[PDB]
Symmetry: C4
Subunit: 364 residues, 4 copies
């Protein structure tokens, strides 16, 4: 029945109107500067990059989504075998469901069976930390899929509107996370869930030892909208209130700038609303080390293995086109390519004290 929520999440995300609903990534305010003399050939473009101790083929990851029941495992299986084929990292959805129910384990474990080489990323929610999870649950989440890192998700906006939500984010949870990180043999990434990471949140996590961030900004999947729908469906009055919050959060573009600026040495996944290899290029150019995606991967996976393979060819082709067209022979060159920032993202950055000169230098 946490199982039911897992199913409902997929169903609404895949089939209802929640992608970018009343929200915006601010990526339209980011322009990559065209170079009519690139100085390179398309074929020499190198998209290889580091993901902790592994090498990955493309600076893109699939971020965590699902697991909990056997038809969710079959979706995981499809994503995983394509991810493995393409050499891209994959996170799984929250594994709480499997900690609570042993029959749910196999829908996660299937990932590692079919993708023995790529980084795989475990997932647990911050609220479970204030509610009694500790080391053991972490190591269990990790060994279940022989994970290379574990993501801990921030979802307070979701929890607030979720019919059976748990909005508990007491400071003690970070004391615990920091102790646990002592004992883990893989790194921790803190990721959001559609509402983005701000400078204050980034600096607070950093002060507890967190070095790896996944922006999951607003503009992509709208998790407040998903829970709103689940509220309409139950006739739960929170639904009209969630409607007033549909545009709540830090936009992806702004969150990439905020995290890069306030924690210049972070390893940074720029995600929330990444829908094309152009978006992924902008995310990286702006300051991310890698671009994350979830929803469009889900929708293709549902359509099948070949649809998902095609989706990835397309993303990769687009990313490379953007590198071609900015004269960027590799990922490091894209991270320093010339951009223009306009409109509302410019005004956000200015109001937040983001000095563009030092910004430019920090993103590189």
């Amino acid at each position: 029945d946490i199982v039911n929520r897992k199913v409902e999440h997929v169903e609404i995300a895949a089939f209802e109107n929640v992608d970018g609903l009343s929200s915006s990534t601010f990526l339209n305010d980011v322009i990559l500067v065209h170079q009519g003399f690139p100085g390179i050939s398309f074929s020499e473009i190198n998209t290889k990059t580091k993901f902790f101790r592994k090498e990955i083929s493309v600076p893109v990851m699939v971020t965590g989504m699902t697991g909990g029941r056997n038809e969710l495992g079959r979706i995981n299986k499809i994503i995983a075998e394509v991810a493995e084929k393409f050499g891209i990292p994959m996170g799984v959805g929250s594994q709480r469901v499997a900690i609570e129910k042993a029959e749910a384990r196999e829908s996660f474990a299937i990932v590692r069976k079919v993708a023995p080489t790529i980084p795989i990323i475990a997932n647990l929610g911050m609220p479970q930390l204030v509610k009694g999870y500790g080391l053991k649950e972490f190591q269990d989440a990790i060994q279940m899929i022989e994970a290379d890192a574990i993501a801990v998700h921030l979802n307070p906006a979701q929890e607030v509107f979720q019919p059976e939500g748990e909005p508990e984010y007491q400071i003690y949870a970070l004391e615990k996370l920091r102790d646990i990180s002592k004992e883990l043999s893989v790194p921790i990434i803190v990721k959001e869930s559609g509402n983005g990471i701000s400078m204050e949140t980034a600096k607070l996590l950093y002060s507890y030892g967190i070095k790896n961030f996944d922006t999951s900004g607003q503009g992509g999947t709208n998790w407040i909208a998903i829970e709103m729908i689940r509220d309409i469906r139950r006739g739960n009055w929170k639904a009209e209130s969630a409607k007033n919050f549909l545009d709540w959060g830090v936009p992806t573009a702004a969150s990439i700038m905020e995290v890069r600026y306030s924690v210049p040495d972070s390893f940074l996944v720029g995600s929330g609303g990444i829908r094309s290899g152009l978006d992924a290029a902008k995310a990286i150019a702006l300051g991310a080390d890698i671009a994350g995606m979830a929803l469009p991967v889900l929708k293709s996976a549902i359509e099948g293995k070949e649809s998902l393979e095609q989706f990835f060819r397309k993303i990769i082709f687009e990313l490379k086109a953007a590198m071609m067209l900015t004269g960027s022979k590799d990922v490091d060159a894209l991270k320093k390519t010339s951009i223009v920032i306009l409109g509302k993202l410019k005004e956000w950055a200015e109001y937040r004290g983001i000095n563009l000169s030092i910004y430019e230098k920090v993103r590189k």
Copy 2:
């Protein structure tokens, strides 16, 4: 006559299209920065605050609306008994009608019968001060409902277009107000009525001893529109002129910044177009001490006691959501939470010499 106007005001406000008609609060240029790690739990959020010598449950008030006839008292009764239940302050509509006609008194006094503990705020119009009111009329408006404060309304835009309006705002009125304040045993609040308080107006009032303000800016009920409609109804030619003034006034968000900036120690109600607990949180984060609402409370009261209780539950939920999602454990924390100011509001503040650095410290 005056009673007919009182009923027509309610009916037009309640049932015609005047809410935000060709006007704007500028609150869409205000963004509360999401914090994916709040550092608190939902259940620990504290919404209590000061309202002069009383404590109120939530930093929200219902501002003055009606009174004058028995069906208007029945609306006052509904508002008052729900306000009392939720522990929130309530102002009554202009009591001039009851000063002029003893049969109108009971439609005010009913408020205190059903709401013995909450702050109750009296109401008189500034024009009546240039036209012969003084101490006695103030003390009467007060004792009629054993008020904890009295509001004096500014409504020159309304009076200019009102068919039987009285646009008299001689400086002598403030000389009188200040002398009256000497002798009153409750504080005075000066409030506008849909057209907002500017820095020059705030400073001028302050120079006469007024320390309590209620912005009532444009963007919510449009009182120029209400009178325009009364003019169309009478075939009074002022109607076409009112139409040219529909967007006249200081937008609520700009008025909050102006007052807090030019009178930093003010006690400040941010109102005019507050329609959700998100709007209330914005008003407060921007500089108000409390958020005020009138029209949506009127529309729900008309639907009934249960509709209005539901309305309040919703507003409070929303407010707390916004506190949750900004890491604000209490109202003082919300007053200092991180914001972003964009677009037209930003341009307003810059043109008006509102130095943002100093704005920040003053709102805190």
Copy 3:
């Protein structure tokens, strides 16, 4: 057959869609700040002002329009007797047509018969000066209506697209104008015709002794559009080209700022798209000494004497409402009232080197 042009002009302005066509005044970027405590009563508002050696009742003028044939005279007669009634100045249309044909004289002279006391303003085009008019033609235009001033119009944009247009603006004409002005017993005003006066044009005229300006900016009557329509009517190919120029010119608001900034001691009519007393109040607040109107006066005059009387009552009411609601007891106070400049107008002024600080000192 210039007389045909004269009638076509009135016909197209009055009945085709040329008012504000693809053009803008920039007055929506100017806000007058609302003062909830005006410090005055409506009844004490004084709209009187100076118009050269006369006193006028309201800071508004009717700018020049027509004359040429007897039905045009009957329009002039209607405008003139209402203008006299209200104590406002009136300019006539270009009198070239009456210099060229004696039968046209009476359609101008009729103005002075029916309006013995108000300022009356003669009119001649600049191109006639380059092409041979001199002193005598000026004095004849003047005596024909016992004018208190003569306007010389700048219409190169019009002349460029006008089928029989004369786009001759050789610098010599200004030498002549200056010599003429030596010998005239009444002042010269230089006015545009829908395309506005720039700082360069204003400083150039000033260097030749011109101190009185009428901005006639874009946003109101679009004379390029009028000529485009006359071009379509003749199947003259200039019509398509005129279409590309529909938004050509300095917007009225930007023209007011430019002229007041570059010639601080000018006597300044702000006109072009003034359609309401609020527009007239903005124009003055921004820097003009008086607001001018032509098209809407033309349209009401056609409908008749009483419709035009009503038109003026409305304008005057509107102007005074703006004064009331900014706390401006008189015209000099309105010239110093608080404003906000936003958006495109702001970006215009910044780009053109209009230092806002010095701007505010200079308009007062």
Copy 4:
């Protein structure tokens, strides 16, 4: 078969919806300051200018388009004879086709037969330079039409999406172009193809001896869109990806600023979306020495000789109207006329470090 591409190119450009598709020149952010007193007569405006060693009648050129087959030749013939009649320069389409196929030569050579006096500009693609072209190919393209210059085109965006495209832009090609330019008896112009020249690209080319640039920015013919359409037609999957890149590139107005700013002594053609003589005036005012056009000349030429003659009368009329209305007696005066830059173009220039003060001095 390259010949098929040549035909399809013309056919899609002339008859599909690709002019300004999802793209923008930014020319609407550029305003020419109207001068109500021009100081000149229309008839004295002088549009003569230099094009390398020749004089041309008007500061406009037709940029290269087509050639390859005899119906393409007949379009080249029409353009050429009108170009000759009006005294304007004409570039031809990429002559690769005629290097590869002797039967395609005559469709280029026809240009010189019918236009013995005007400047004629040859055309080759940068990618053919990385892939083996050298001096001889350059000299053949030149002698084939007795060219006065040869344009080399930058089209990586196009090549990336083109079904049979060749996205090779290795730095070596510039070493070769530099050596070739040693040996050529005519100058080289480097032009883009709808995606614009940036300051990095311009400075790089300059460092290799290139002093003549043709911006061909975004906002006019969208070459990504043309290839996208060829991809739809073949069912090539690159189509959906092209669609994500529709708004890729430097807008014409920004490109002109960037090239003029970064290479102040460049000879500069401003092109890409020039559709009227007002556009042409803006491009020159902003920094270009000449305005270039392709697509609308193609569409008129297809309709016939008289339609193209009319097209040019109209452009020239428009150009001269903009000169008249800015008080510009000649091209040098238009280069230094007063402008206003707003909106996104302003923000582009600011973000890219284009100091407007120095920009003004350099543009003049």
